[PDB]
Scaffold this active site. Structure first.
Site: not given
Ligand SMILES: CC(C)(C)NC(=O)[C@@H]1C[C@@H]2CCCC[C@@H]2CN1C[C@@H](O)[C@H](Cc1ccccc1)NC(=O)[C@H](CC(N)=O)NC(=O)c1ccc2ccccc2n1
Ligand SMILES: [Cl-]
Ligand SMILES: [Cl-]
Ligand code: NA
Lengths: 99, 99
Positions: B25-27
């Site tokens: 997961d690069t995000g």
């Molecule tokens: C965007 C969407 C299409 C809804 N997909 C997803 O959300 C899927 C769902 C999957 C099942 C649940 C577990 C996570 C996976 C991977 N994710 C993608 C995944 O890459 C997701 C994308 C993202 C980035 C930034 C802000 C929000 C969301 N990242 C995350 O959920 C990570 C978790 C962590 N390390 O704390 N968040 C962050 O790294 C992060 C960075 C900055 C922020 C600023 C404000 C609020 C929130 C912030 N979260």
């Protein structure tokens, strides 16, 4: 390019004539952008992530440039904390993960 | 290897003596795993994403095997809907995004 992961993989995108910053995200199925105006009709979608679900607006066949590469595809708009480029558009620009 | 993005980039990991499936997961800033026991001390943390925040336990200096590659770092444990390998461990296996 070849992008390492010591910092967040942020790039410039162009949508509706406007430049924005967005995250290249291999963990996202879909592309989701913060509130903005887009042309045409929209359809409903519910998407889930780490803290629960949000409601978004689905727009199809939208023109979008990502790090200078042209794409045309589906864009979701709603209360996301960040602009995210997911696998539907990463595949259009020919992106892979390598190790 | 070279991993394409037509489907979710899922791989086998070994953590705490257990075999699990997880998403590359690069995000994601952090590595987050579903409820399990790990050795040593921990402290509480709040982490955010698309639907808001969840409460997790933070464990430092945990060894993990990711698709055959050994790495060490911080692992968060809590009510995540999916197991995710984030940038803190992707850097250690040499992973890059290429287009
Ligand atoms: C965007 C969407 C299409 C809804 N997909 C997803 O959300 C899927 C769902 C999957 C099942 C649940 C577990 C996570 C996976 C991977 N994710 C993608 C995944 O890459 C997701 C994308 C993202 C980035 C930034 C802000 C929000 C969301 N990242 C995350 O959920 C990570 C978790 C962590 N390390 O704390 N968040 C962050 O790294 C992060 C960075 C900055 C922020 C600023 C404000 C609020 C929130 C912030 N979260
Ligand atoms: Cl609706
Ligand atoms: Cl770490
Ligand atoms: Na420890």
């Amino acid at each position: 390019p070849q992008i390492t992961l010591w910092k967040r993989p942020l790039v410039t995108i162009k949508i509706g004539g406007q430049l924005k910053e967005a995250l290249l995200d291999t963990g996202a199925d879909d592309t989701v952008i913060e509130e903005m105006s887009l042309p045409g009709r929209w359809k409903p979608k519910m998407i889930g992530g780490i803290g629960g679900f949000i409601k978004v607006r689905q727009y199809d066949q939208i023109i979008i440039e990502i790090a200078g590469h042209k794409a045309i595809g589906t864009v979701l708009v709603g209360p996301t904390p960040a602009n995210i480029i997911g696998r539907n558009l990463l595949t259009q620009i020919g992106a892979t993960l390598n190790f």
